[PDB]
Design an enzyme around this catalytic site. Structure first.
Site, PDB file in Angstrom:
ATOM      1  N   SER A  40       3.735   2.683   8.341  1.00 47.65           N
ATOM      2  CA  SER A  40       3.629   1.609   7.349  1.00 47.65           C
ATOM      3  C   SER A  40       4.617   1.288   6.579  1.00 47.65           C
ATOM      4  O   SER A  40       5.325   2.102   6.085  1.00 47.65           O
ATOM      5  CB  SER A  40       2.466   1.961   6.358  1.00 47.65           C
ATOM      6  OG  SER A  40       0.943   1.958   7.065  1.00 47.65           O
ATOM      7  N   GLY A  41       4.843  -0.201   6.301  1.00 43.67           N
ATOM      8  CA  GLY A  41       5.931  -0.683   5.584  1.00 43.67           C
ATOM      9  C   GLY A  41       7.186  -0.919   6.263  1.00 43.67           C
ATOM     10  O   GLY A  41       8.088  -1.709   5.811  1.00 43.67           O
ATOM     11  N   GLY A  63       2.052   6.714   9.295  1.00 47.72           N
ATOM     12  CA  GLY A  63       3.525   6.831   8.783  1.00 47.72           C
ATOM     13  C   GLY A  63       4.592   5.926   9.161  1.00 47.72           C
ATOM     14  O   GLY A  63       5.709   6.094   8.903  1.00 47.72           O
ATOM     15  N   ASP A  81       0.107  -7.515   1.749  1.00 52.96           N
ATOM     16  CA  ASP A  81       0.362  -6.196   1.708  1.00 52.96           C
ATOM     17  C   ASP A  81       1.791  -6.276   1.773  1.00 52.96           C
ATOM     18  O   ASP A  81       2.631  -5.937   3.044  1.00 52.96           O
ATOM     19  CB  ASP A  81      -0.185  -5.447   2.727  1.00 52.96           C
ATOM     20  CG  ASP A  81      -0.041  -3.855   2.889  1.00 52.96           C
ATOM     21  OD1 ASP A  81       0.382  -3.491   1.957  1.00 52.96           O
ATOM     22  OD2 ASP A  81      -0.423  -3.320   3.830  1.00 52.96           O
ATOM     23  N   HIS A 124       0.807  -0.954   0.106  1.00 54.61           N
ATOM     24  CA  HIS A 124       0.009  -0.179  -0.068  1.00 54.61           C
ATOM     25  C   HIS A 124       0.687   1.411   0.019  1.00 54.61           C
ATOM     26  O   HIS A 124       0.171   2.202  -0.080  1.00 54.61           O
ATOM     27  CB  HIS A 124      -1.020  -0.209   1.051  1.00 54.61           C
ATOM     28  CG  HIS A 124      -0.560   0.395   2.603  1.00 54.61           C
ATOM     29  ND1 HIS A 124      -0.378  -0.653   3.442  1.00 54.61           N
ATOM     30  CD2 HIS A 124      -0.437   1.647   2.922  1.00 54.61           C
ATOM     31  CE1 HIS A 124      -0.097   0.271   4.521  1.00 54.61           C
ATOM     32  NE2 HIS A 124      -0.026   1.685   4.274  1.00 54.61           N
TER      33      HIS A 124
END
Ligand SMILES: [Ca+2]
Length: 223
Positions: free
Chosen positions: A177-178, A175, A84, A40
């Site tokens: 994410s990933g 902020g 994801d 995402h």
């Protein structure tokens, strides 16, 4: 990260910031040329920033390298958030040293109760917004599959797990994410989603990286 602590400069040497004129997501360096992040987080114009602590100041030890490939999982579903995960290939290899280092992929999945380190430059507030300069860290356990499904009925796939604290106050956030969830030296999770941040009975939900190790290896080998 809500309810965490200042990591200390370069103490999480595999943590990267994905930057498009601003920090927008985290990622994890898995070898000198490849980063794991969330599907995402995909967009054009990604610059990977390695060696960061204060993302707003050039302090030394940074390496800024453009993404040359950004490979979202072919089965990423933007509604259920299943699969994801994304791989980013760096245009040039990073120089690895004590402050910029890779994190190992899992050889097996992690069990409920395993303690992990979650990190990022995301929001530090559960209500409102405050974005930090320096990298934040949180120690958090993996929750049972029953507790995770109770918290998020009908929304947890085999490629997700929950981690954190049902009492509220400690979580990843927008902020983050990933970014990484590292447990016993292995990258077991990717910051993915949750309802609010640090809310009671609403833990974080993370991509289950152990399910993707063969896909990561095969994709890297062919690119
Ligand atoms: Ca910096």
């Amino acid at each position: 990260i809500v309810g965490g602590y200042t990591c200390g400069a370069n103490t999480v040497p595999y943590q990267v910031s994905l930057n498009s004129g601003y920090h927008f997501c985290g990622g994890s360096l898995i070898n000198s040329q490849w980063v794991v992040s969330a599907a995402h987080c995909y967009k054009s114009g990604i610059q990977v920033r390695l060696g960061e602590d204060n993302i707003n100041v050039v302090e030394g030890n940074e390496q800024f390298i453009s993404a040359s490939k950004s490979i979202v999982h072919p089965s990423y579903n933007s509604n259920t958030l299943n699969n994801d995960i994304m791989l980013i290939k760096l245009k040039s290899a990073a120089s690895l040293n004590s402050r910029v280092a890779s994190i190992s992929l899992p050889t097996s999945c992690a069990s409920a109760g395993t303690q992990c380190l979650i990190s990022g430059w995301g929001n530090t507030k559960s209500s409102g917004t405050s974005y930090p300069d320096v990298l934040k860290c949180l120690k958090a356990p993996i929750l049972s599959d029953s507790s995770c499904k109770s918290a998020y009925p009908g929304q947890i796939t085999s490629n997700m797990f929950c981690a954190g604290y049902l009492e509220g106050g400690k979580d990843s956030c927008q902020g983050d994410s990933g970014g990484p969830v590292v447990c016993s030296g292995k990258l077991q999770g990717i910051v993915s989603w949750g309802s609010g941040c640090a809310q009671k009975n609403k833990p974080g939900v993370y991509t289950k990286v152990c399910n993707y190790v063969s896909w990561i290896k095969q994709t890297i080998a062919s690119n």
